[PDB]
Amino acid sequence: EVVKFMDVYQRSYCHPIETLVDIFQEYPDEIEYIFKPSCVPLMRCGGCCNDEGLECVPTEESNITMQIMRIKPHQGQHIGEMSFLQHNKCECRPK
Amino acid sequence: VVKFMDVYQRSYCHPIETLVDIFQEYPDEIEYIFKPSCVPLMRCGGCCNDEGLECVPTEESNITMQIMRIKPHQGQHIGEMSFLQHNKCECRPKKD
Numbered sequence: 738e739v740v741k742f743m744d745v746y747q748r749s750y751c752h753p754i755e756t757l758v759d760i761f762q763e764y765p766d767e768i769e770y771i772f773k774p775s776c777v778p779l780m781r782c783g784g785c786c787n788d789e790g791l792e793c794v795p796t797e798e799s800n801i802t803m804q805i806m807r808i809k810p811h812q813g814q815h816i817g818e819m820s821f822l823q824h825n826k827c828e829c830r831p832k
Numbered sequence: 833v834v835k836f837m838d839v840y841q842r843s844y845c846h847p848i849e850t851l852v853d854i855f856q857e858y859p860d861e862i863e864y865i866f867k868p869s870c871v872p873l874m875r876c877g878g879c880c881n882d883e884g885l886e887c888v889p890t891e892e893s894n895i896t897m898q899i900m901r902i903k904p905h906q907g908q909h910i911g912e913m914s915f916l917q918h919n920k921c922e923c924r925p926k927k928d
Contacts, residue, residue, distance in 0.1 A: 738896065740895065740896065740898065749851055773840070776878060778839075803833065804834065804836040804839065816836055
């Protein structure tokens, strides 16, 4: 059983793909709190362009808001809204 | 606004389609050029409940894909290359 060349090529080509992103990494200022969940699923460009001079980059973006729990260890916790950047379209482009 | 329970369930440690550079899987073959240069594989991803835990595979299998294997000074052919897939994941304590 084998994935055919053109199917691999098409499926792997530069495009927005659900990507699991660490919240603190996105918001490194909030070092005092723990986020739960600690990561969020976001559409982000991924995949390849198959040309050493090209890179997969966003060409359209927007924000998405989600409810995230902020935790203060041994202290308390509260659910609030947090916004994240998402990639709506991606294209291969000169570096 | 995505509701807390949806985000928590969607983000929790599980196998996720992940686009992976072939050289990461075959670093011993950096003398080649591959097309496509990356492949879509199921790999454990997402987050565990706390920073003392990591999301690791508990079931694995192989997937075989046709890849154009190129040596610019020798030739090229479409060959089969096998890649590791993760079929199930769990959160386990980090070692260290």
